[PDB]
Amino acid sequence: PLPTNHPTQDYARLIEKAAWREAIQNKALALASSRAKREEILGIKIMGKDSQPTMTQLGGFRSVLKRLHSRNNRDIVTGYLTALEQVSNRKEKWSNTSQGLTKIRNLVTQENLIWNHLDIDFSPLTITQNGVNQLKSELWAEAVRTLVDAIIRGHKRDLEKAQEN
Amino acid sequence: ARKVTTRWKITGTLIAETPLHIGGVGGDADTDLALAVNGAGEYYVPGTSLAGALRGWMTQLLNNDESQIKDLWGDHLDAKRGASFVIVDDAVIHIPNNADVEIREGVGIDRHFGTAANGFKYSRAVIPKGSKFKLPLTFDSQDDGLPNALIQLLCALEAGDIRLGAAKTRGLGRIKLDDLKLKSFALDKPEGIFSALLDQGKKLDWNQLKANVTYQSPPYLGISITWNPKDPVMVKAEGDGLAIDILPLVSQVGSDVRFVIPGSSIKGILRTQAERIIRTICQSNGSEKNFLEQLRINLVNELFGSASLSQKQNGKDIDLGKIGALAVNDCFSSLSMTPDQWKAVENATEMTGNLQPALKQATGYPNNISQAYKVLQPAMHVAVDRWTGGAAEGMLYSVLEPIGVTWEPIQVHLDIARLKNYYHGKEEKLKPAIALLLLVLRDLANKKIPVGYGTNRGMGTITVSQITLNGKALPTELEPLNKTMTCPNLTDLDEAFRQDLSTAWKEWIADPIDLCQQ
Amino acid sequence: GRKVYPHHKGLPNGYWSNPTEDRSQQAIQGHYQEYRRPKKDGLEQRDDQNRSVKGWVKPLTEFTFEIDVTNLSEVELGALLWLLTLPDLHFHRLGGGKPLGFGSVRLDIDPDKT
Amino acid sequence: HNPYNFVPALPRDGITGDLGDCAPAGHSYYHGDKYSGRIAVKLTTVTPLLIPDASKEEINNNHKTYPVRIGKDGKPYLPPTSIKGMLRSAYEAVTNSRLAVFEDHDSRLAYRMP
């Protein structure tokens, strides 16, 4: 790895983000391609024709996650989840998920957890010393958004195979 | 090397006068169409995209003469032209303050059901408005002086006539040049070559060349509509709020947020009424067609545009796509807020709690909830269960109705030159498209076209108090369009002109051929 | 079936008049002031079961609105126009407080603007 | 009289024509046989009309006081949604359509023994 003071450290860091971003994206595709991995990460599942929760409830969450630009915005998503949880009829909309409301709470509030789900080995993808710690602190919110977007797309397109018969 | 009598460095600030979208390969997990970014990840205008914007405009200015275009922009195949004499650099975009990119929602509305067509739900990342980027232009002159066509180009930039990026008809792409500077280096001579190396060049007074020339603005018609909302008007924001479920869409307009009616929205309502008129006359149903087929009907394909779609006709291969001659610009309110004042509203949690200060702040009436709520009014709505009365479980929702937001005029731009090209030069073929457009404006003025969210549900009715038709270099028989209309029924246009249009309109109705087929 | 709030026919003169007065306990012309929460011990019963209103739209006030209709058949249109041309003393019920007599309205068409 | 009653929702199997279930006319064009246009309506109040503005509701001891909802000219803003829901429920009744808002109602209700 480059010495931290090295003059090409700035340029190298542009190469790193690119390699990390595209790695996160490709892994999010793979993880979203299986229904067991979608249920593990968000609790989202198919029950015959039915989606747990309905796609409208996933769209509501996904519309709030668009506001997760940084970890200073995780209060926005935790605001949404507490409001959802505080309304009994909306909470019940998420029963028969595999604990999906708390899985969302965790992913938004445990910074390591997106990386645990992605489980990318970033060593082939970093060259700056302290590259992994800084890029994880930098790309966290984008990784969360990227994984949930992929999961919800793979969910809906597996739902279409069960629903459109 | 290549001989250069004088090298010119032409530079200034280009400002986004509307939002902007140059696309990369596409899609960033937050937008289906993602902005182009340089290797540093900064939003930028590719010099390719600006070169073709300026070459394209110049191609229309110079009546598509290949000779003078290739004299300035080079040619791969002529044996004496090769490389371009205009260098266009990649220019990074400085979004004002550090405003983030906006995401703009899009939907196709099924023409039979009047509702979002399946699959036709999309989003585009757009550069705000007010954002600046460099005009990175260099010109190597072999002739003496500076070309007239290049002076005309710089005039069009300062006029704001060139459009850049995607969605040019659907709201986006307007740029304006400010602070144009011309630096000249006589690379043909010792003193000018050393000036290139050391002295940063001779400053030319642009105003002197700007005086030597008249700006040859191409034929266009511009329609500006003055509307006040009769019933609240608002496009829905991208997602449900906390204290208010349904909030108006806002955009960054400089350092402030304003309420926006996307031009994509004004164009889809105008297109929908335009198509409904055409289908009504031909008695042509839209229920069996899919949404891409529903859109594709005569006159609107030229005015509003059609999707690119290469089709083998018979051996010959033809693009059915054409850009819209009709372009609509996003509309903005008289009413602006600081980016945090609106966040105070979006992040309010109790309608009678912290929302009240947020709306009092954002409306500019911090001490008059009454005056504040004559501008932005929260409205509660219930669905009432039909056996019990009361309210249906869960079916309680709230709208922030912009009951008293004041809006700017809607600005439509008809590229008469683009239409005339579709009609292969025949100015007589313009009259049905003009007649349609005036019929669409008659309906708009008569409240027949509601705009935005909730049109059937207490919102979206507009009052049109003035339409100003203001075309430039119009063909002589279309010149009676140059009128400020205030009667909704077009009776401010000369009756002999409305009868002439009606005659050509009726001639087309009698045989509604594809008017750009020849 | 569909729950409806029949018009409160025959409410006497001054029934809605001076509504702050607790006339709930006298049969003025045979009706009690049924829309108003009675006082208890001479004090207002502004409990959290009832609401209160700072005012209301007066009777005999008039609103104009427009209906824009698309592709109505003659049955679908005739059903609508029947509601908008009901004979005299037919009244629609609107807004809130309908069990208490509020929101009885007369709808009729303005033909010159149709 | 109880202040509510019901309008029988007769079952609609075998109902035909414009009162039946039908494919919608649609929005793509004005059908030669089907009417479109503007209807102008006069609405006049017979009893007072409550138009509570819940955005400006004020609370003491959990009791809510509502002002009248007013527009940008200070006249009462009667919402078109409130008109539409009155009109729709009246329309559904006299046309005998499907009931547009039926909540779940899928649990058995409960009662008490004598």
Short mmCIF file of C-alpha atoms in Angstrom, two decimals, chain B residues 370 373-374 377 403, chain D residues 51 53 56 67-78:
data_model
loop_
_atom_site.label_atom_id
_atom_site.label_comp_id
_atom_site.label_asym_id
_atom_site.label_seq_id
_atom_site.Cartn_x
_atom_site.Cartn_y
_atom_site.Cartn_z
CA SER B 370 -53.88 32.84 9.27
CA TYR B 373 -52.21 29.27 5.94
CA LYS B 374 -53.64 31.47 3.21
CA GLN B 377 -52.71 25.19 4.02
CA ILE B 403 -53.73 27.36 -1.86
CA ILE D 51 -66.01 23.04 7.70
CA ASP D 53 -59.90 23.34 9.87
CA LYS D 56 -55.74 25.15 13.22
CA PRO D 67 -62.24 27.17 13.44
CA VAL D 68 -63.95 27.23 10.07
CA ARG D 69 -61.71 26.48 7.11
CA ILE D 70 -61.22 29.63 5.06
CA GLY D 71 -59.63 30.35 1.70
CA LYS D 72 -57.13 32.95 0.57
CA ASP D 73 -59.99 35.49 0.50
CA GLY D 74 -61.22 34.65 4.01
CA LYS D 75 -64.46 33.16 2.75
CA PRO D 76 -65.16 29.57 3.83
CA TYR D 77 -63.14 27.10 1.77
CA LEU D 78 -65.56 24.27 1.16
#
